[PDB]
Design an enzyme around this catalytic site. Structure first.
Site, mmCIF file in Angstrom:
data_model
loop_
_atom_site.group_PDB
_atom_site.id
_atom_site.type_symbol
_atom_site.label_atom_id
_atom_site.label_comp_id
_atom_site.label_asym_id
_atom_site.label_seq_id
_atom_site.Cartn_x
_atom_site.Cartn_y
_atom_site.Cartn_z
ATOM 1 N N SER A 255 1.990 1.173 16.363
ATOM 2 C CA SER A 255 2.467 1.854 15.155
ATOM 3 C C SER A 255 1.360 2.758 14.626
ATOM 4 C CB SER A 255 2.896 0.816 14.130
ATOM 5 O OG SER A 255 1.859 -0.066 13.805
ATOM 6 N N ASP B 50 0.008 -7.705 1.684
ATOM 7 C CA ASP B 50 0.517 -6.326 1.745
ATOM 8 C C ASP B 50 2.027 -6.301 1.908
ATOM 9 O OD1 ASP B 50 0.547 -3.559 1.753
ATOM 10 O OD2 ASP B 50 -0.308 -3.379 3.789
ATOM 11 N N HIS C 55 0.802 -1.204 0.000
ATOM 12 C CA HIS C 55 0.000 0.000 0.000
ATOM 13 C C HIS C 55 0.838 1.259 0.000
ATOM 14 C CE1 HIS C 55 0.337 -0.116 4.460
ATOM 15 N NE2 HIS C 55 0.420 1.181 4.278
ATOM 16 N N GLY D 161 2.709 6.709 8.836
ATOM 17 C CA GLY D 161 4.113 6.970 8.607
ATOM 18 C C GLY D 161 5.024 5.833 8.997
ATOM 19 N N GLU E 14 19.546 6.527 8.365
ATOM 20 C CA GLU E 14 18.943 7.714 8.979
ATOM 21 C C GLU E 14 18.705 7.536 10.459
ATOM 22 O OE1 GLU E 14 18.496 10.592 8.010
ATOM 23 O OE2 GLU E 14 17.696 10.774 5.968
ATOM 24 N N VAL F 136 17.720 16.130 9.421
ATOM 25 C CA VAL F 136 19.079 16.654 9.513
ATOM 26 C C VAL F 136 20.046 15.643 8.926
ATOM 27 C CG1 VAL F 136 20.937 17.312 11.127
ATOM 28 C CG2 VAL F 136 18.512 17.915 11.640
ATOM 29 N N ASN G 63 17.882 11.175 12.526
ATOM 30 C CA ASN G 63 17.096 12.372 12.310
ATOM 31 C C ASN G 63 16.855 12.523 10.801
ATOM 32 O OD1 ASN G 63 16.102 14.996 11.994
ATOM 33 N ND2 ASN G 63 17.152 15.694 13.826
ATOM 34 N N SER H 231 4.078 2.572 8.245
ATOM 35 C CA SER H 231 3.796 1.530 7.265
ATOM 36 C C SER H 231 5.011 1.134 6.509
ATOM 37 C CB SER H 231 2.795 1.953 6.191
ATOM 38 O OG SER H 231 1.496 1.663 6.603
ATOM 39 N N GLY H 232 5.121 -0.172 6.282
ATOM 40 C CA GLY H 232 6.215 -0.711 5.516
ATOM 41 C C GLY H 232 7.421 -1.077 6.339
HETATM 42 CA CA LIG Z 1 19.421 12.403 8.663
#
Ligand SMILES: [Ca+2]
Ligand SMILES: [Cl-]
Lengths: 52, 223
Positions: B172, B84, B40, B175, B52, B57, B54, B177-178
């Protein structure tokens, strides 16, 4: 874009994506973040279709 | 992630952010050229961001790599969210290191009661919206199939499991998802759906990755 209390906003999807969509809410387009497949991905495409 | 905490920088080194000008979904790195996410989350124009913490940043451990292929399960059902799962191929290989690392696929399914780690950059509020800068984490148990079907009668397929809490406050959310549900060092789930977030009697629902080992292997071999 201010949506009045009581207005019917888009139905929140059950999925857990955070898409950014623009929906026409009365006179103006507002951004919605979440599992939304409706509206428009571009603000300007919503705006030229708002009101409707 | 609602009701969780700060994972700590690069402590979930298989966690990726899918970006299309903004973060919209998570994913899990399974080898140097492939990410697992939710079907989805499919859209055009995906950049995978590895390393990642942050996401707002540049901290120096990021790898920014375009998705060259984004392959939903052919039997994904967008109404029921059955199957899914999606595989994303990276245009160039990730450089694997301590901060960017793959997560093992399961050899077998996990059992009810197993505490797993769920992570993401999704909403931290169950009403209204607050999106975090840094990666958030939640420890959550796998619930029994019967408990899952009690919460969501008629909606749980054999390719789904529930994890989390029945009394509210921890889940959860949009944002996430996955992204990963990791149990015992294995990717057992993909953040998929639920009735809102962190609501009483409505735990999160997750794609059951152990059912898709063959599909994942064959997809990677053929693309
Ligand atoms: Ca970053
Ligand atoms: Cl625009």
């Amino acid at each position: 874009c201010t949506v009045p209390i009581g207005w019917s906003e888009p139905v929140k999807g059950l999925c857990k994506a955070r898409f950014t969509r623009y929906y026409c809410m009365g006179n103006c387009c507002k951004v919605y973040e979440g599992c939304y497949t409706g509206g428009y991905s571009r603000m300007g495409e919503c705006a030229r279709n708002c009101p409707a | 992630i609602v009701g969780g905490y700060t994972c700590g920088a690069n402590t979930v080194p298989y966690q990726v952010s899918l970006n299309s000008g903004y973060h919209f979904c998570g994913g899990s790195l399974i080898n140097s050229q492939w990410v697992v996410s939710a079907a989805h989350c499919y859209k055009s124009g995906i950049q995978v961001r590895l390393g990642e913490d942050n996401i707002n940043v540049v901290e120096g451990n990021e790898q920014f790599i375009s998705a060259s292929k984004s392959i939903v399960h052919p039997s994904y059902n967008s109404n029921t969210l059955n199957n899914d799962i999606m595989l994303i191929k990276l245009k160039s290989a990730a450089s694997l290191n301590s901060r960017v690392a793959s997560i093992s696929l399961p050899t077998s399914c996990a059992s009810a009661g197993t505490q797993c780690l769920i992570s993401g950059w999704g909403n931290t509020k169950s009403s209204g919206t607050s999106y975090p800068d840094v990666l958030k984490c939640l420890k959550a148990p796998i619930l029994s199939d019967s408990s899952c079907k009690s919460a969501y009668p008629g909606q749980i397929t054999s390719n789904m499991f529930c994890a989390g809490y029945l009394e509210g406050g921890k889940d959860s959310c949009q944002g996430d998802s996955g992204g990963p549900v990791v149990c015992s060092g294995k990717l057992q789930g993909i953040v998929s759906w639920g009735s809102g977030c962190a609501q009483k009697n409505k735990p999160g629902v997750y794609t059951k990755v152990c059912n898709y080992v063959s599909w994942i292997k064959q997809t990677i071999a053929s693309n």
